[PDB]
Design a protein around this ligand. Structure first.
Ligand SMILES: Cc1ccc(NS(=O)(=O)c2cccc(C#N)c2)c2[nH]cc(C#N)c12
Ligand SMILES: [Zn+2]
Lengths: 183, 783, 56, 208, 82
């Protein structure tokens, strides 16, 4: 139902573009009459403008936003909720204490995957970027996201770990069976 | 397809927990005992303990606490199972009718969160404001205790301290306050937090964090007027309460770790402390009355009372009587008296309760290697009739030698490194009290092979192995074309510098004229974990290699073939030319010895992650496994492509609820098993039709038989690990089906209602109560 | 000695010196135990932003 | 703490878990050289490690104006040679003119599929373009664990949809370049959260 | 010119992807290698980040050296390149 959400569903048997195929190369059969692909989108641009309009106290002094950086803070598979932090470079007039200034802020937003509906959980204070470069601000922003996830880091079970493998490694370990492959 | 039936021969005997309180009536002083899944309720009467009722919970009892919220005339019981089933139970008696009411229940498991190292901890606030649960690292679960609401909405609070050792709720606090010992890279520390039900968060604790002893292992919440907390370590005992900080470092406690405590006096003036060696102490809190009415703690004193069984838990009862709940030995009722006896002890045993656990090995009528340390014994079980043979040291392995009319028992005793040259024993035991003894050629564990008479169980001979040599495996058999029967021992060299064994021996002994003669020795480059007679050859597993040895006419072991694809080949079982290999970390595998090839052939392997405890061959095509998560599983050859034949399928799954250390050989076959809790069970095979009838009967019994705490039987017996949860398959709970004979006649008719089904090799029956009574009665005769 | 004067709930308890419970079809409950579904980080941020909303 | 002292504790406690053997050294160490097939020496595979169950060991190929990527499944059996099970062509009908930093991931409970995230240091067009970056993501089905009734139905040397499908997608990201967060992106089984710098897309692939 | 930096005094749970996210906004990175313990199976707390541009690496050091990432003050410096 909302304008910020877009959902697409496609079925197969023998927005982002999908080149669904078999192990050989055949592009299968794209139809809606088996494989099931789902695509739930969340437009950052819409969310930012919506949260500033209704949930930012400083919303009246806002002019326009420039770049934005989205860092996921939490994924709850039981409640199907994605907690995203929205780093934002914007233009706004200051308090009556004008002249338009560049500021940086953080917008925490909870995104429901069952409904597709987002909810705002935090609106940051407008902090001035005085002669700090674009890289300076995004580095400090991400550093705060890292800081938070580490602060709230609760150890997960053995069996619920996301395995991540990459080689540009001395040993390939099978932790659970205390087996190493020495390279 | 494989169909199995599991039934209990002997219920668990080890005591995991015990609490005192007023559960049955406000007047009755009760004793509640937890024996794994079993809850025993007693009334402390003039005669001792009057049993009230024993209830089997559909779960391993992890938390057992009595509490009285305001408005209750009697204490309510809180129980949490190993599967995270939480319940508040109320005892109700109406004349001769007895009922255990489930006041509230639910599962308090989290999908996130990893089980904590020091396990599930369950604490109740003194003012019954809430229940505190430490289930996972990083999280503290709080169940609010509100009586005027449909649901008890439990919540998690983040704990920065990811490694908590022990926690308790403090007394005399305006705000519910937890006091806990935690570990971090800077050591161990004691910290407090106030618990806010309104904000669903922690607030700054009443007193500052204090640094504690490196091995500070338990917290004691001292009641009013003292208040505060006692922290017990390896070398010290401290008291903390805001301003106050008392510390005693008594040398008495240094030798052994204190592992249990029990409040004697309601005001916390005296506590009983039990250590790993079975020593019993009295912790004394000396008070000072203040003029403002309050009482302050002036000093701490510990005094040794005597010796009891190695206590898992202690509970003071009434009139100087203490219940000693033992896990490694027999449970006791001990009397405390002010006048010391002949040895100077203030503790006198009143009663002894047989505990078969841990069954670390057994023989077949049944002979087990029971208990550990000073509680080490042999137990002879037949038609149940139990005979106990005290060893006063750890029995490890047992084997029977019919031709010598004796048993071979591997055992270990603790000796201490003193001011003098070598080491000396602390207590007399089987290995030091044998009729005759020998020593090998060419604190610490001293390993021995004991020759014990099959009739008297007298220690005929004790052979001591080399300095730092551990005896791991044992067989009694005849090898090759040699007519003689030998006691074969597999060893490992355990040094106080290295972690993994890189040296060991296979030693062939012959017992004759009351003495043991070393026939042959074979050096290995690792630990000889398991050995099995295999078609007149010796099958042995050294670290990660399974090896076949031939016995020459020259009385020597000659290696024939090797299989190297293992991580830790700990368990071996054979049937004909087939070998079932059990790995500590890599599930199971099937090998085949190829006689005309003189080598092994890797037939099939179970590709499932499983940390094995024991294995057994049911038949040529069905293999039984028991793992670390207390489940049983059955592997079958996939019944075709070579890759498909190389894959063992787990066709049977069942949550046993016990840790199996040994398997040994209507229904077909009898595999008896020994567990850590001293429970003894039987596994047997069923036909497809027998299974189908008994499974329908289980579903019908579950609709009629009620569960305490409202735990579903199906949930309880579901195969469960940290990786997966699956409903039990191809397994019948014999205990559940046997309970049909114990239900009333009107309830039997509702169970067998519109039941015919029964396809006894062909067509359908028409089942009555009497038809099934005859079925269940024949099944009770299997054990 | 400090082993004299042990607790006495009743003197008539040790001076002198179990049936299986098969719950028959009978089920009267009272309450259920449930766990808070919502994440602890979300709950906290919800809690802090709702306190900022109260800040009049 | 000696392994045998640790093992004895197990027998009398019934407490056997990997988070107890945590501090002890590996039980088995085998060199890659002694388990790798000699015909794959000239191939130049890049070994990635073990799948969550110790059954498989994965590797990739960065074969060559354009680059072609391949994902391999090797059957592991401690000292035995690795046996090749599955070889798939990553990022179908996609011409990559720069060597990608690829990462193979696995879901918490779903052992049916794997995800391959490959990205270049900076996008192109021939000439390196500083404002863009190319993200390539492939969802590949893992080989069947045992005998499969649907797989048995074959006309050539093959695999059913459940145990033999592939999914491909490509997207351009802008400054600040979105962070790679593999643990959160795959926290929900069968969903990949993809930050396209303009939107976050929830991608669910499931076979019924 | 091409410059390589030394990043140290890091929290052991800081990932290569986290380091990439923190350093990437200053300029293009050719390579990042966070040093891992073979025996622990966890970060050593140090690594090397190689920017395509020397002036971009200079600003990354100026803005990140001595500043706390997860409570630990980060040590960003230069390297031999000889
Ligand atoms: C802020 C942040 C959080 C998490 C990850 N990666 S992750 O999702 O794989 C993850 C999640 C939780 C803990 C760990 C660990 N150790 C890893 C990040 N990668 C780059 C980031 C930036 N800036 C970043
Ligand atoms: Zn298939």
């Amino acid at each position: 139902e909302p304008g910020y959400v877009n959902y697409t569903k496609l079925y197969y048997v023998l927005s982002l573009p999908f080149v669904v195929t078999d192990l050989r190369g055949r592009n299968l059969r794209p139809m809606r009459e088996y494989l099931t692909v789902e695509q739930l989108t969340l437009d950052f641009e819409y969310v930012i403008n919506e949260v500033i309009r209704h949930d930012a106290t400083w919303g009246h002094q806002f002019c326009s936003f420039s770049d934005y950086d989205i860092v996921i803070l939490e994924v709850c598979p039981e409640t199907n909720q994605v907690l995203i932090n929205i780093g934002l470079l914007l233009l706004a007039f200051p308090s009556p204490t004008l002249r338009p200034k560049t500021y940086h802020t953080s917008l925490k937003v909870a995104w429901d995957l069952n409904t597709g509906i987002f909810e705002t959980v935090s609106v940051g204070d407008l902090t001035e970027v005085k002669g700090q470069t674009s890289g300076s601000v995004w580095s400090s922003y991400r550093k705060s996201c890292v800081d938070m996830v580490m602060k709230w880091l609760v150890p997960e079970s053995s069996g619920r770990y996301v395995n991540r493998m990459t080689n540009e490694l001395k040993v390939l370990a099978d932790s659970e069976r205390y087996t190493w492959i020495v390279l | 397809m494989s169909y199995n039936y599991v039934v209990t021969a002997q219920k668990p005997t080890a005591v995991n927990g015990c609490v005192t309180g007023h559960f049955t009536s406000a007047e009755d002083l009760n004793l509640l005992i937890a024996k794994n899944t079993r809850l025993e309720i007693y009334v402390v009467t003039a005669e001792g303990l009057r049993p009230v009722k024993e209830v089997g919970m559909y779960g391993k009892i992890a938390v057992m606490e009595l509490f009285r919220p305001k408005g209750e005339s009697k204490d309510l019981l809180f129980i949490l199972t190993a599967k995270y089933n939480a319940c508040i139970l109320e005892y109700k008696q109406s004349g001769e009718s007895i009922d255990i009411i489930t006041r509230a229940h639910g599962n308090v498991q989290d999908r996130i969160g990893r089980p904590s190292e020091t396990g599930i901890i369950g604490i109740i606030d003194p003012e019954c404001r809430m229940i505190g649960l430490r289930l996972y690292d990083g999280l503290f679960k709080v169940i609010p205790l509100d009586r005027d609401n449909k649901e008890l909405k439990a919540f998690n609070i983040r704990l920065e301290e990811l490694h908590v050792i022990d926690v308790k709720f403090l007394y005399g606090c305006q705000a519910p306050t937890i006091c806990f010992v935690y570990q971090d890279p800077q050591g161990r520390h004691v910290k407090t937090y106030e618990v806010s039900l309104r904000e669903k968060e922690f607030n700054k604790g009443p007193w500052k964090q204090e640094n504690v002893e490196a091995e500070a292992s338990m917290v004691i919440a001292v009641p009013e007027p003292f208040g505060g907390a006692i922290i017990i370590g390896q070398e010290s005992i401290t008291y903390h309460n805001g301003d106050k900080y008392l510390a005693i470092a008594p040398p008495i406690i240094k030798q052994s770790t204190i592992v249990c405590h029990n409040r004697v006096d309601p005001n916390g003036s005296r506590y009983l402390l039990g250590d790993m060696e079975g020593r019993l102490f009295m912790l004394l809190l000396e008070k000072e009355e203040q003029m403002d009415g309050t009482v302050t703690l002036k000093d701490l004193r510990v005094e040794l009372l005597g010796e009891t069984s190695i206590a898992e838990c202690l509970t003071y009862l009434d009139n100087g009587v203490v219940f000693v709940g033992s896990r490694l030995g027999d449970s006791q009722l001990v009397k405390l008296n002010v006048d010391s006896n002949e040895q100077g002890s203030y503790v006198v045993a009143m009663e002894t309760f047989t505990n078969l656990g841990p069954i670390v090995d057994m023989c077949v009528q049944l002979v087990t290697c029971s208990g550990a340390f000073k509680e080490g014994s042999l137990r002879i079980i037949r038609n149940l009739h139990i005979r106990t043979v005290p060893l006063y040291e750890s029995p490890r392995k047992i084997c029977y030698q019919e031709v010598s009319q004796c048993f071979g028992v591997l055992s270990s005793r603790i000796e201490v490194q003193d001011t003098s040259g070598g080491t000396t024993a602390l207590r007399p035991s089987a290995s030091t009290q044998a009729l005759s003894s020998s020593v090998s050629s060419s604190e610490v564990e001293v390993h021995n092979l004991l020759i014990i008479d099959q009739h008297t169980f007298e220690v005929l001979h004790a052979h001591q192995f080399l300095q730092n040599e551990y005896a791991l495996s044992l067989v009694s058999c005849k090898l090759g074309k040699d007519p003689n029967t030998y006691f074969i021992v597999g060893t490992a060299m355990v040094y106080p510098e290295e972690a993994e064994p890189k040296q060991g021996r296979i030693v062939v002994f012959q017992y004759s004229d009351g003495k043991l003669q070393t026939v042959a020795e074979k050096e290995v480059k690792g630990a000889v974990y398991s050995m099995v007679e295999f078609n007149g050859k010796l099958l042995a597993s050294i670290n990660s290699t399974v090896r076949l040895y031939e016995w020459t006419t020259e009385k020597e072991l000659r290696t024939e073939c090797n299989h190297y694809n293992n991580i830790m080949a700990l368990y071996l079982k054979t049937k004909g030319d087939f070998i079932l290999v059990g790995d500590l970390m890599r599930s199971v595998l099937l090998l085949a010895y190829k006689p005309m090839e003189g080598n092994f052939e890797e037939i099939a392997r179970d590709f499932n992650p499983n940390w094995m405890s024991a294995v057994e061959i049911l038949d040529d095509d069905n293999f039984l496994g028991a793992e670390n998560a207390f489940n049983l599983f059955v592997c079958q050859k996939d019944s075709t492509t070579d890759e498909e034949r190389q894959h063992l399928q787990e066709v049977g799954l069942f949550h046993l609820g016990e840790f199996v250390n040994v398997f040994c050989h209507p229904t077909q076959g009898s595999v008896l098993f020994g567990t850590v809790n001293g429970m003894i069970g039987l596994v047997t095979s069923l036909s497809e039709s027998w299974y189908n009838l008994l499974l329908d009967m289980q579903n019908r019994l579950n609709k009629v038989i009620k569960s305490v705490g409202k735990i579903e039987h199906s949930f309880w017996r579901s195969f469960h690990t940290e990786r997966k949860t699956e409903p039990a398959t191809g397994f019948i709970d014999g205990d559940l089906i046997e309970s049909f004979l114990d239900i009333s006649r009107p309830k039997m008719q509702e169970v067998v209602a519109n039941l015919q089904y029964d396809d006894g090799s062909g067509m359908k029956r028409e089942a009555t109560a009497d038809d099934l009574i005859k079925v269940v009665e024949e099944l009770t005769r299997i054990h | 000695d400090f082993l004299k004067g042990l607790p006495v709930y009743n003197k008539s308890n040790f001076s002198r010196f179990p049936s299986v419970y098969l719950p028959t079809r009978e089920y009267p409950s009272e309450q259920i135990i449930v766990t808070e579904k919502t994440n602890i980080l979300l709950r906290y941020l919800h809690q802090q932003w709702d306190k900022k909303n109260a800040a009049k | 703490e000696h392994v045998l002292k640790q093992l004895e504790r197990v027998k009398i406690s019934g407490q056997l878990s990997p988070r107890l053997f945590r501090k002890l050294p590996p039980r088995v160490c085998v060199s890659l050289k002694n388990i790798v097939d000699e015909d794959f020496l000239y191939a130049g595979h890049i070994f990635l490690g073990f799948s969550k169950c110790g059954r498989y060991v994965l590797s990739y190929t960065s074969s060559s104006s354009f680059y072609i990527y391949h994902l391999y499944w090797w059957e592991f059996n401690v000292h035995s040679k690795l046996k090749l099970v599955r070889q798939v062509r990553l990022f179908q009908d996609e011409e990559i003119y720069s060597d990608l930093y690829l990462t193979v991931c696995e879901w918490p409970s779903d052992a049916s599929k794997v995800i391959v995230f490959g990205f270049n240091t900076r996008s192109a067009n021939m000439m390196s373009d500083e404002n863009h970056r190319d993200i390539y993501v492939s969802t590949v089905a893992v080989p069947p664990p045992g005998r499969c009734a649907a797989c048995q139905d074959a006309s050539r040397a093959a695999q059913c949809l459940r145990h033999g499908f592939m999914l491909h997608t490509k997207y351009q990201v802008v400054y600040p370049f979105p962070t790679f967060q593999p643990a959160f992106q795959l926290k929900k089984d069968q969903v990949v959260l993809l930050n396209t710098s303009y939107s976050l897309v929830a991608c669910a692939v499931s076979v019924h | 010119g091409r410059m390589r930096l030394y990043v140290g005094s890091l929290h052991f749970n800081i990932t290569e992807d986290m380091l990439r996210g923190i350093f990437e906004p200053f300029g293009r990175i050719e390579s990042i290698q966070l040093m891992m313990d073979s025996e622990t199976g966890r970060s050593k707390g140090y690594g090397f980040i190689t920017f395509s541009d020397s002036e971009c690496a200079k600003k990354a050091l100026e803005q990140l050296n001595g500043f706390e990432l997860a409570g630990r003050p980060m040590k960003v410096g230069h390297v031999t390149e000889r």
